[PDB]
């Protein structure tokens, strides 16, 4: 089934109901007017980043480049790979744009410090995937450009998800969620799980260790919050 919409629950209603027990819920009106949401165009997002260093993930491979060169090879051109700005702090990178976003007040329900919450850019083409696994701390994920969809699966399935038993690995899944081999991972079937397609302005709550599936249907720029 679907995730939750809420409009600007309270922090007690959000704690109580969805940070306490771990739930997923996507918060609405909340970063809808944070200016990403009008400014973030791709020539914007060259003007003012475009000469800068970025990480990206290929295919795989990750390798460095300017965001300009990034957004040629990668978004505007027929790419010839699937080319992704995941995971990076921009905004440590280049403060002008942090004037752009906020830190959503309910992290402030949380047990660490605001100078420990990770900011982290997730900026590519359609097409973009994730591959199921799980982060040990809350997040916001917050939708400034396209869609995403979002498969979410609760920590108490983690068995019919078969993570690598390589250590490194282990916060990952063996399963390709959306094409599952089935013969070799049959628990998965079984599995319940949440969907959704997170659009502009909405936020994703996704709980701590709850395992989470990505994939961009548009051209799409993500903000996640890292946060305890
Ligand atoms: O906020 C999160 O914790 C969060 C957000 C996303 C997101 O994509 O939005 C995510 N996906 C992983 C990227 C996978 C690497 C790759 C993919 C395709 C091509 C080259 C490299 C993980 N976690
Ligand atoms: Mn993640």
Redesign the pocket.
């Known amino acids: 089934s679907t995730v939750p919409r809420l409009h600007r629950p309270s922090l007690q209603h959000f704690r109580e109901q969805f940070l306490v027990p771990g739930r997923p819920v996507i918060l609405k009106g909340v970063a809808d007017h944070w200016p990403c949401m009008q400014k973030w165009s791709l020539e914007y997002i060259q003007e003012i980043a475009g000469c800068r260093t970025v990480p990206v993930?290929?295919?795989?491979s990750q390798t460095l480049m300017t965001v300009n060169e990034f957004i040629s090879k990668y978004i505007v051109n027929e790419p010839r790979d699937?080319?992704?700005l995941?995971?990076h702090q921009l905004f440590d990178q280049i403060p002008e744009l942090k004037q752009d976003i906020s830190i959503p007040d309910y992290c402030s329900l949380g047990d660490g410090e605001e100078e420990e919450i990770t900011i982290?850019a997730?900026f590519?083409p359609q097409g973009?995937?994730?591959?199921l696994?799980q982060?040990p701390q809350q997040?916001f994920?917050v939708q400034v450009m396209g869609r995403?969809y979002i498969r979410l699966y609760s920590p108490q399935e983690s068995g019919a998800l078969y993570p690598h038993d390589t250590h490194l690995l282990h916060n990952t899944s063996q399963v390709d969620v959306e094409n599952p081999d089935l013969e070799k991972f049959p628990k998965f079937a079984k599995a319940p799980f949440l969907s959704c397609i997170l659009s502009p302005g909405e936020i994703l709550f996704?709980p701590v260790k709850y395992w989470?599936y990505?994939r961009?249907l548009d051209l799409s720029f993500?903000v996640?919050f890292?946060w305890s």
Do not use: C, F, R
């Open positions: 993930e290929v295919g795989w699937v080319g992704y995941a995971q982290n997730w590519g973009t995937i994730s591959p696994h982060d997040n994920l995403k996704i989470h990505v961009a993500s996640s890292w």
